[PDB]
């Protein structure tokens, strides 16, 4: 598959019903568990994947409480850009961020070993 | 024990008699003295104990002028949750807020050094 997922989902009487996990471990908000039956189910939402965009606003570098602010602050409907860990194992190939952009259109180009050996600084000014 | 008190006090002629203290040193409502005699000392209450609930509910996140307002419109009785500075130190450990439910039930489990050096974040959603 190795595309991005939009999870449109309503709050239920008792929330969304999944969790989000994070640690010093690793970067990245995680999906540690969803609820069955569940408005984060029916969306489309399982454990493992990782949050990069909430409501149309990228994620990355930002902390835990600020994705959970974020979430919080959407009212009662969310929308939630995520990526399955193979997925997300094929987005830092390409040093790409996903973004709505890779639901439908062309994905990117992973780079080479050979290109990563270059240890190239490059920077747009 | 371990366990919280609640102390059921009504008022005298010049009141339940008892000072409560708070700066910003230290979070928390917390007994500075209890007059001898008084209606507040028969309840069980004792200096440096602290205010977790009045009349049901919990103080916890409050202000002073709060928590004293709470007292105030109580009318001429109060039920007041307290820990004292022992009590406070574990559910601290524990990272659960004492309730009515802790003068009864069985108490937490404080979490070991090895699991809070994770830093783990999580959040129900």
């Known amino acids: 598959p190795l595309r991005p997922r939009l999870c449109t989902m309503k709050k239920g009487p008792s929330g969304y019903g999944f969790n989000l996990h994070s ?10 568990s969803v609820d069955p039956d569940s408005p984060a189910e029916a969306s489309g939402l399982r454990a ?6 909430v409501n149309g606003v990228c994620m990355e570098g930002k902390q835990h409480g600020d994705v959970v602010s974020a979430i919080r602050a959407g ?3 969310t929308k ?8 997300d194992e094929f987005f830092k190939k390409c040093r790409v ?6 639901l439908n259109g062309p994905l990117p180009v992973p780079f080479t070993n050979g290109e990563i050996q270059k240890e190239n600084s490059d920077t747009r000014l």
Chains 1, 2 share one sequence.
């Open 97 to 102: 961020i996903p973004s709505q952009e890779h």
């Open 23 to 32: 640690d010093k471990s690793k970067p990245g908000q995680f999906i540690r």
């Open 75 to 77: 009212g009662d409907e």
């Open 80 to 87: 939630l850009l995520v990526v399955d860990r193979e997925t």
């Open 48 to 53: 493992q994947d990782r949050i990069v965009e």
